[PDB]
């Protein structure tokens, strides 16, 4: 074993450098050339609030087992993660660093780091994904507190003590640092805004939420107080080890990446614990726009399946808004969830309604319209009743965005409806004026269909299209469908 300053980073990183002409983003979807230029212990700016710097940390804190899983990580980024932990953490609080090599292409990426003081390397015999890889590390951990980090992170000054302090006081707090940004193109370390919380929209993709005016005002007494958060990112958090185990680890049927941070956030809040972001704790993370690795079965499929498993277990009736937002997820089998449903039951977890009202009151229920009401627009003109009733013609007029004569609905009956009147093809002879008549289910003259990417209206069972060319000489007509601006119509929602 060597102390990390004696580790031969040049030999290690030199084995896998990008060659001349080669794409520096191909392997990792960040710039490996810029990662490889950095020293393993490169200095980073202290991004903490001034109030953090005047802090003495409770002394008798529990040591942690740091679990880092990785799959085909750049050697420079993985090493720099390990070193940031060893250099920026008090040694007596680092029991061990467990690297879980999740079936990387090259087993030396991990094996060579095994040389370093306090590093334990666990290589998976097959691809396991981050969830099962994290449970593997966590099951192997000897300490009383778990820390999970992604494999391209850089810990900052006194990042660890503020997290440990929270968990030492209350074992049911699951806590994360502010996620500073390591730029994926040039690897500069930049501080994140401290005014953020974790959240999601109904498509159940994690996002950062900006604090409301009132939330910020309430924090002026102490801007470094813990931020209670509806959701944590997955890349860095600290959790009491027994709490992790008792509360159900991670869902072992989740694969590769995605949705475990959603699942664990719901679980922790619904089953009586809490989530916090801790401003005095800062850890940089290389954010990316694409995953560099394979998803056995397809990245869309996998992510949807993982999310279904979380939604079906935690979200009660609210899961319906996810399927509404992501219809395609309905097509994705998700396997057996009994273990997880029973876990929820055993722990007497609270309903999702409880979470929305008490944890994430900012998330607004989606706004439902089974039917399209609005304008049928052609440039700056709108389909207009002209103020006519049954047997009158229709036309186009400057859009006034005031509904009225310019408000229509596209019915499931395949009609074009204003109140109880429908656009009626009284004569199929090309060039004929259409008329309003009372809507009847059984009037084939009143049936229209949107065609060409919802850009024209064709009369069902004909090759006739609604046409405005006759507007100045009597009103809208049916005309043979062809390339004419006068046959273009966009339904614009109210």
């Amino acid at each position: 074993k060597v102390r990390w300053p004696d580790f031969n980073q040049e030999a290690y990183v030199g084995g896998t450098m990008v060659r001349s002409g080669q794409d520096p983003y191909a392997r990792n979807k960040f710039n490996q050339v810029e990662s490889d230029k950095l020293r393993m212990d490169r200095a980073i700016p202290d991004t903490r609030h001034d109030q953090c710097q005047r802090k003495q940390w409770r002394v008798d804190l529990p040591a942690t087992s740091v679990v880092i899983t990785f799959h085909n990580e750049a050697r420079s980024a993985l090493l720099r993660t390990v070193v940031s932990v060893l250099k920026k953490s008090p040694p007596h609080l680092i029991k061990e660093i467990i690297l879980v090599d999740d079936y990387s292409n090259d087993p030396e990426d991990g094996a060579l780091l095994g040389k370093i003081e306090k590093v334990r390397v666990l290589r998976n015999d097959r691809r396991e994904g981050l969830m099962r890889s994290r449970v593997r590390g966590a099951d192997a951990a000897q300490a009383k507190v778990l820390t999970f980090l992604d494999s391209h992170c850089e810990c900052n000054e006194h990042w660890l003590e503020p997290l440990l302090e929270r968990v030492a006081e209350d074992r049911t707090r699951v806590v994360s640092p502010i996620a500073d940004v390591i730029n994926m193109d040039n690897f500069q370390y930049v501080g994140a805004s401290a005014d953020l919380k974790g959240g999601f929209d109904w498509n159940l993709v994690f996002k950062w939420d900006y604090m409301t005016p009132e939330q910020r005002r309430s924090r002026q007494g102490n801007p470094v107080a813990p931020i209670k958060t509806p959701m944590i990112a997955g890349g860095a958090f600290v959790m009491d080890k027994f709490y992790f185990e008792e509360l159900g680890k991670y869902d072992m049927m989740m694969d590769v990446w995605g949705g475990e941070n959603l699942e664990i956030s719901f679980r922790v809040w619904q089953c009586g614990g809490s989530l916090e972001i801790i401003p005095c704790s800062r850890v940089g993370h290389v954010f990316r726009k694409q995953h560099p690795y394979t998803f056995p079965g397809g990245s869309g499929t996998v992510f949807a399946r993982n999310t279904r498993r979380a939604a079906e277990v935690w979200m009660d009736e609210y899961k319906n808004f996810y399927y509404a937002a992501v219809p395609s997820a309905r097509n994705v089998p998700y396997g057996n969830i009994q273990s997880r449903l029973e876990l929820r039951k055993k722990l007497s977890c609270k309903p999702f309604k409880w979470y929305l009202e008490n944890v994430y009151p900012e998330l607004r229920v989606p706004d439902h319209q089974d039917i399209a009401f609005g304008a049928l627009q052609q440039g700056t003109n709108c389909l207009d009743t002209l103020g006519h009733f049954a047997d009158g013609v229709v036309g186009v007029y400057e859009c006034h965005n005031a509904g009225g004569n310019q408000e229509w609905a596209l019915t499931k009956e395949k009609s074009v409806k204003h109140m109880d009147l429908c656009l009626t093809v009284v004569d199929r002879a090309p060039g004929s004026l259409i008329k309003l008549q009372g809507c009847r289910e059984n009037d084939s003259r009143q049936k229209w269909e949107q065609i060409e990417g919802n850009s024209k209206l064709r009369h069902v069972g004909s090759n006739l299209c609604l046409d405005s060319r006759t507007a100045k000489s009597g009103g809208l007509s049916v005309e043979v469908c062809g390339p004419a601006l006068s046959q273009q119509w966009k339904f614009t929602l109210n």
């Binding site: 930049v190 501080g191 994140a192 805004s193 994690f206 996002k207 997955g234 890349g235 990316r288 990245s299």
Partner: peptide, 9 residues
């Protein structure tokens, strides 16, 4: 597709 970056300071 991936965890998004927070807005910077």
């Amino acid at each position: 597709s991936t965890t998004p970056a927070p807005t910077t300071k």
